[PDB]
Protein backbone atom coordinates (compact mmCIF):
# COMPACT_ATOMS: atom_id res chain seq x y z
CA UNK A 1 0.00 0.00 0.00
CA UNK A 2 2.05 2.94 -1.37
CA UNK A 3 0.89 6.58 -0.96
CA UNK A 4 1.29 9.67 -3.18
CA UNK A 5 2.89 12.42 -0.98
CA UNK A 6 2.52 16.13 -1.82
CA UNK A 7 4.84 18.55 0.05
CA UNK A 8 4.68 22.33 0.06
CA UNK A 9 3.35 24.39 -2.83
CA UNK A 10 2.05 27.92 -3.42
CA UNK A 11 -1.36 29.55 -3.07
CA UNK A 12 -1.05 33.34 -2.43
CA UNK A 13 2.18 32.32 -0.49
CA UNK A 14 4.52 29.27 -0.05
CA UNK A 15 2.89 26.37 1.89
CA UNK A 16 3.84 23.89 4.64
CA UNK A 17 1.31 21.15 3.73
CA UNK A 18 2.31 17.51 3.70
CA UNK A 19 -0.56 15.33 2.44
CA UNK A 20 -0.74 11.75 1.19
CA UNK A 21 -3.21 10.31 -1.32
CA UNK A 22 -4.27 6.67 -1.31
CA UNK A 23 -5.14 5.83 -4.96
CA UNK A 24 -6.79 2.58 -3.70
CA UNK A 25 -9.60 4.10 -1.55
CA UNK A 26 -9.41 7.77 -2.67
CA UNK A 27 -8.50 9.15 0.77
CA UNK A 28 -6.24 12.07 1.72
CA UNK A 29 -4.11 11.97 4.91
CA UNK A 30 -3.01 15.24 6.61
CA UNK A 31 0.58 14.77 7.78
CA UNK A 32 3.08 16.85 9.78
CA UNK A 33 3.71 20.23 8.19
CA UNK A 34 7.12 21.15 6.70
CA UNK A 35 9.13 23.17 9.32
CA UNK A 36 9.67 25.98 6.76
CA UNK A 37 6.99 26.70 3.99
CA UNK A 38 8.30 26.12 0.46
CA UNK A 39 7.23 26.16 -3.21
CA UNK A 40 9.38 25.28 -6.24
CA UNK A 41 10.78 22.34 -4.31
CA UNK A 42 11.18 18.76 -5.51
CA UNK A 43 10.36 15.52 -3.66
CA UNK A 44 11.98 12.07 -3.72
CA UNK A 45 12.13 8.82 -1.75
CA UNK A 46 15.30 7.04 -0.56
CA UNK A 47 14.83 3.93 1.59
CA UNK A 48 11.21 4.59 2.57
CA UNK A 49 12.15 8.15 3.68
CA UNK A 50 10.67 11.22 1.94
CA UNK A 51 12.94 14.20 1.10
CA UNK A 52 11.95 17.83 0.35
CA UNK A 53 14.72 19.57 -1.65
CA UNK A 54 15.28 23.29 -2.23
CA UNK A 55 12.53 25.71 -3.20
CA UNK A 56 11.69 29.15 -1.88
CA UNK A 57 9.61 30.57 0.91
CA UNK A 58 7.43 33.36 -0.58
CA UNK A 59 5.75 35.30 2.36
CA UNK A 60 3.70 38.56 1.94
CA UNK A 61 6.61 40.32 3.77
CA UNK A 62 9.67 38.64 2.18
CA UNK A 63 11.06 35.89 0.00
CA UNK A 64 13.80 33.35 0.86
CA UNK A 65 15.37 30.82 -1.56
CA UNK A 66 16.07 27.43 0.04
CA UNK A 67 19.31 25.34 0.16
CA UNK A 68 17.46 23.02 2.62
CA UNK A 69 17.11 19.25 2.55
CA UNK A 70 14.55 17.83 4.94
CA UNK A 71 13.65 14.26 5.63
CA UNK A 72 10.21 12.90 6.54
CA UNK A 73 9.72 9.52 8.21
CA UNK A 74 6.21 8.11 7.45
CA UNK A 75 6.54 5.77 10.46
CA UNK A 76 7.13 8.56 12.99
CA UNK A 77 5.33 11.53 11.26
CA UNK A 78 8.48 13.64 11.84
CA UNK A 79 10.52 15.99 9.59
CA UNK A 80 14.29 15.99 10.35
CA UNK A 81 16.73 18.53 8.86
CA UNK A 82 19.60 17.17 6.73
CA UNK A 83 22.80 18.84 5.47
CA UNK A 84 21.94 21.79 3.16
CA UNK A 85 23.08 22.11 -0.51
CA UNK A 86 26.02 24.37 -1.51
CA UNK A 87 23.57 27.00 -2.84
CA UNK A 88 19.85 27.80 -2.60
CA UNK A 89 17.87 26.20 -5.47
CA UNK A 90 14.33 27.35 -6.22
CA UNK A 91 12.45 25.68 -9.21
CA UNK A 92 14.78 22.66 -8.74
CA UNK A 93 14.75 19.25 -10.40
CA UNK A 94 15.61 16.08 -8.47
CA UNK A 95 16.51 12.51 -9.46
CA UNK A 96 17.67 9.42 -7.52
CA UNK A 97 20.34 6.90 -8.62
CA UNK A 98 21.62 4.18 -6.21
CA UNK A 99 20.07 5.89 -3.18
CA UNK A 100 21.78 9.21 -4.02
CA UNK A 101 19.80 12.40 -4.54
CA UNK A 102 20.86 14.69 -7.43
CA UNK A 103 19.81 18.43 -7.10
CA UNK A 104 19.69 19.93 -10.62
CA UNK A 105 19.85 23.63 -11.53
CA UNK A 106 17.35 26.01 -9.97
CA UNK A 107 17.63 29.70 -9.07
CA UNK A 108 19.16 31.80 -6.34
CA UNK A 109 17.86 35.34 -6.88
CA UNK A 110 19.47 36.53 -10.13
CA UNK A 111 21.56 33.31 -10.55
CA UNK A 112 20.29 30.47 -12.82
CA UNK A 113 22.28 27.33 -11.93
CA UNK A 114 23.81 24.90 -14.38
CA UNK A 115 25.45 23.31 -11.25
CA UNK A 116 24.42 19.89 -9.99
CA UNK A 117 25.16 18.26 -6.61
CA UNK A 118 24.71 14.79 -5.17
CA UNK A 119 23.56 13.83 -1.65
CA UNK A 120 24.67 10.66 0.14
CA UNK A 121 22.12 9.77 2.91
CA UNK A 122 24.60 7.35 4.55
CA UNK A 123 27.26 10.10 5.01
CA UNK A 124 24.80 13.14 5.21
CA UNK A 125 26.90 15.06 2.63
CA UNK A 126 26.45 16.99 -0.62
CA UNK A 127 29.21 17.08 -3.27
CA UNK A 128 29.15 18.92 -6.60
CA UNK A 129 29.27 16.76 -9.76
CA UNK A 130 29.79 17.99 -13.42
CA UNK A 131 27.53 21.04 -14.19
CA UNK A 132 24.98 20.85 -17.03
CA UNK A 133 25.71 22.32 -20.49
CA UNK A 134 22.78 24.76 -19.96
CA UNK A 135 21.65 26.78 -16.91
CA UNK A 136 18.13 25.48 -16.13
CA UNK A 137 15.43 26.56 -13.60
CA UNK A 138 11.92 25.00 -13.77
CA UNK A 139 13.72 21.88 -15.06
CA UNK A 140 12.20 18.39 -15.24
CA UNK A 141 14.42 15.54 -14.06
CA UNK A 142 14.07 11.82 -14.88
CA UNK A 143 16.19 8.73 -14.17
CA UNK A 144 16.28 6.27 -17.08
CA UNK A 145 18.87 3.48 -17.67
CA UNK A 146 20.89 4.79 -14.65
CA UNK A 147 21.31 8.13 -16.51
CA UNK A 148 19.98 11.48 -15.24
CA UNK A 149 17.99 13.56 -17.79
CA UNK A 150 17.47 17.39 -17.36
CA UNK A 151 14.48 18.37 -19.59
CA UNK A 152 13.45 21.91 -20.61
CA UNK A 153 13.49 24.82 -18.21
CA UNK A 154 14.59 28.46 -18.40
CA UNK A 155 18.24 29.61 -18.64
CA UNK A 156 17.69 33.26 -17.58
CA UNK A 157 16.97 34.57 -21.09
CA UNK A 158 15.07 31.75 -22.85
CA UNK A 159 12.45 29.09 -22.05
CA UNK A 160 13.88 25.70 -23.30
CA UNK A 161 12.74 22.73 -25.43
CA UNK A 162 16.32 21.37 -25.09
CA UNK A 163 17.21 18.34 -22.95
CA UNK A 164 20.52 16.80 -21.77
CA UNK A 165 21.77 13.58 -20.23
CA UNK A 166 24.17 12.85 -17.30
CA UNK A 167 26.42 9.76 -17.22
CA UNK A 168 27.29 9.23 -13.49
CA UNK A 169 30.19 6.83 -14.20
CA UNK A 170 31.83 9.18 -16.71
CA UNK A 171 30.73 12.36 -14.78
CA UNK A 172 29.55 14.13 -17.94
CA UNK A 173 26.57 15.67 -19.76
CA UNK A 174 25.55 15.20 -23.40
CA UNK A 175 22.70 17.05 -25.17
CA UNK A 176 19.90 14.74 -26.39
CA UNK A 177 17.01 15.27 -28.91
CA UNK A 178 15.08 18.47 -28.02
CA UNK A 179 11.28 18.27 -27.34
CA UNK A 180 8.70 19.46 -29.93
CA UNK A 181 7.53 22.09 -27.36
CA UNK A 182 9.43 24.69 -25.24
CA UNK A 183 8.56 23.86 -21.56
CA UNK A 184 9.55 25.55 -18.29
CA UNK A 185 7.84 24.02 -15.20
CA UNK A 186 6.69 20.81 -16.86
CA UNK A 187 5.99 17.55 -15.01
CA UNK A 188 8.78 15.09 -16.01
CA UNK A 189 8.75 11.36 -15.12
CA UNK A 190 9.64 7.82 -16.31
CA UNK A 191 7.00 5.22 -17.22
CA UNK A 192 7.63 1.92 -19.12
CA UNK A 193 11.18 2.99 -20.22
CA UNK A 194 10.00 6.41 -21.64
CA UNK A 195 10.39 10.01 -20.34
CA UNK A 196 7.12 12.01 -20.25
CA UNK A 197 7.04 15.83 -20.31
CA UNK A 198 3.51 17.01 -19.29
CA UNK A 199 2.41 20.64 -19.29
CA UNK A 200 4.70 23.56 -18.55
CA UNK A 201 5.02 27.12 -19.87
CA UNK A 202 6.14 27.76 -23.52
CA UNK A 203 6.89 31.49 -22.90
CA UNK A 204 3.35 32.48 -24.00
CA UNK A 205 0.76 30.15 -22.35
CA UNK A 206 0.50 27.14 -19.90
CA UNK A 207 0.36 23.77 -21.75
CA UNK A 208 -1.88 20.68 -21.55
CA UNK A 209 0.16 18.86 -24.25
CA UNK A 210 2.15 15.77 -23.22
CA UNK A 211 5.08 14.20 -25.08
CA UNK A 212 7.25 11.12 -24.41
CA UNK A 213 10.87 10.38 -25.30
CA UNK A 214 11.66 6.93 -26.74
CA UNK A 215 15.38 6.22 -26.17
CA UNK A 216 15.66 3.47 -28.91
CA UNK A 217 14.43 5.93 -31.59
CA UNK A 218 15.73 9.14 -29.85
CA UNK A 219 12.39 10.90 -30.63
CA UNK A 220 9.76 12.89 -28.70
CA UNK A 221 6.15 11.92 -29.60
CA UNK A 222 2.90 13.62 -28.49
CA UNK A 223 0.51 11.48 -26.49
CA UNK A 224 -3.02 12.47 -25.28
CA UNK A 225 -3.16 16.02 -23.70
CA UNK A 226 -4.43 16.63 -20.12
CA UNK A 227 -7.95 18.10 -19.50
CA UNK A 228 -6.32 21.17 -17.80
CA UNK A 229 -3.43 23.41 -18.92
CA UNK A 230 -0.84 23.50 -16.09
CA UNK A 231 2.71 24.62 -15.22
CA UNK A 232 4.44 24.07 -11.79
CA UNK A 233 2.53 20.78 -11.56
CA UNK A 234 3.55 17.87 -9.32
CA UNK A 235 4.13 14.53 -11.05
CA UNK A 236 4.57 10.88 -10.08
CA UNK A 237 4.19 7.32 -11.31
CA UNK A 238 2.03 4.90 -9.22
CA UNK A 239 1.14 1.36 -10.41
CA UNK A 240 1.85 1.94 -14.15
CA UNK A 241 -0.02 5.28 -14.29
CA UNK A 242 1.05 8.94 -14.27
CA UNK A 243 -0.50 11.30 -11.70
CA UNK A 244 -0.36 15.13 -12.18
CA UNK A 245 -1.16 17.21 -9.08
CA UNK A 246 -2.26 20.85 -9.09
CA UNK A 247 -0.31 23.55 -10.90
CA UNK A 248 -0.96 27.02 -12.30
CA UNK A 249 -3.17 27.68 -15.34
CA UNK A 250 -2.40 31.44 -15.68
CA UNK A 251 -5.08 32.66 -13.22
CA UNK A 252 -6.09 29.73 -10.98
CA UNK A 253 -4.04 27.41 -8.72
CA UNK A 254 -5.41 23.93 -9.55
CA UNK A 255 -6.65 21.33 -7.05
CA UNK A 256 -7.25 18.92 -9.97
CA UNK A 257 -5.48 15.53 -9.91
CA UNK A 258 -5.35 13.83 -13.34
CA UNK A 259 -4.27 10.25 -14.07
CA UNK A 260 -2.74 8.97 -17.41
CA UNK A 261 -3.29 5.33 -18.47
CA UNK A 262 -0.65 4.43 -21.12
CA UNK A 263 -2.69 1.33 -22.24
CA UNK A 264 -5.70 3.46 -23.35
CA UNK A 265 -3.74 6.77 -23.95
CA UNK A 266 -6.30 8.63 -21.79
CA UNK A 267 -6.24 11.10 -18.89
CA UNK A 268 -9.00 11.20 -16.22
CA UNK A 269 -9.69 13.27 -13.08
CA UNK A 270 -9.23 10.85 -10.15
CA UNK A 271 -9.33 13.28 -7.20
CA UNK A 272 -9.02 16.88 -6.01
CA UNK A 273 -6.32 18.10 -3.60
CA UNK A 274 -7.75 19.53 -0.28
CA UNK A 275 -6.88 22.99 -1.74
CA UNK A 276 -5.43 24.32 -5.02
CA UNK A 277 -1.69 24.92 -5.28
CA UNK A 278 1.35 25.06 -7.60
CA UNK A 279 5.06 24.17 -7.13
CA UNK A 280 4.59 21.09 -4.97
CA UNK A 281 7.16 18.33 -4.45
CA UNK A 282 5.70 14.85 -5.11
CA UNK A 283 6.96 11.28 -4.32
CA UNK A 284 5.52 7.72 -3.82
CA UNK A 285 6.39 5.35 -0.83
Residues interacting with Cl ion, by CB under 5 A? Answer: 40
Residues 133-172 that bind ligand Q9E (CB under 6 A): 138
Among 106, 185, 199, 234, binds ligand Q9E (CB under 6 A): 185
Q: Pick from 3, 6, 21, 58 the residue near ligand Q9E by CB under 6 A.
A: 58
Query: Can residue 236 be called a binding residue for ligand Q9E (CB under 6 A)?
Result: no
Label residue 140 left, alpha or beta by phi (over 0 means left) and psi (-120 to 50 means alpha): beta
Q: H or E stretch including 258?
A: strand 256-261
SS3 178: coil
Q: What character string, x for contact with ligand Q9E (CB under 6 A) and - otherwise, covers 91-130?
A: x---------------------------------------
DSSP β-ladder status, 93-97 and 62-65? unpaired
When asked if residue 183 is in the footprint of ligand Q9E (CB under 6 A), the reply is no
> From Na ion, ligand Q9E, Cl ion, none, which one binds at residue 112 (CB under 5 to 8 Å depending on kind)?
none
How long a stretch of residues is the chain?
285
Residue among 23 and 234 whose Cβ is closer to ligand Q9E: 234
What does the radius of gyration of the chain's CA atoms come to, in whole angstroms? 17
Residue 130: CA count within 13 A, CB half-sphere:
16
Q: How crowded is residue 17: how many other Cβ atoms within 10 Å of its Cβ?
A: 19
Nearest to 257 by CA among 274, 245, 242: 245
Instruction: Give whichever of 66 and 115 is closer to ligand Q9E, judged by the CB atom.
Output: 66
| Residue 266 DSSP SS3 | strand
Of the residues 5, 126, 248, 267, which one makes contact with ligand Q9E according to CB under 6 A = 248
Name the closest residue to ligand Q9E (Cβ). 279
Binding residues for ligand Q9E (CB under 6 A)? 10, 39-40, 58, 91, 138, 185, 231-232, 248, 278-279
Amino acid sequence: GRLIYTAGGYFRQSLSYLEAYNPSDGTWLRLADLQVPRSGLAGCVVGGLLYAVGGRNNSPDGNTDSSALDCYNPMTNQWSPCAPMSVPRNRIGVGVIDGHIYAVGGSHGCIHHNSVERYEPERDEWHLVAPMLTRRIGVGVAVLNRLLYAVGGFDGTNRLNSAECYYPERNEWRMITAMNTIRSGAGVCVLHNCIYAAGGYDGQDQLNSVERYDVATATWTFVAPMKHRRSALGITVHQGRIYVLGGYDGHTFLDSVECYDPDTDTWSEVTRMTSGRSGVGVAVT
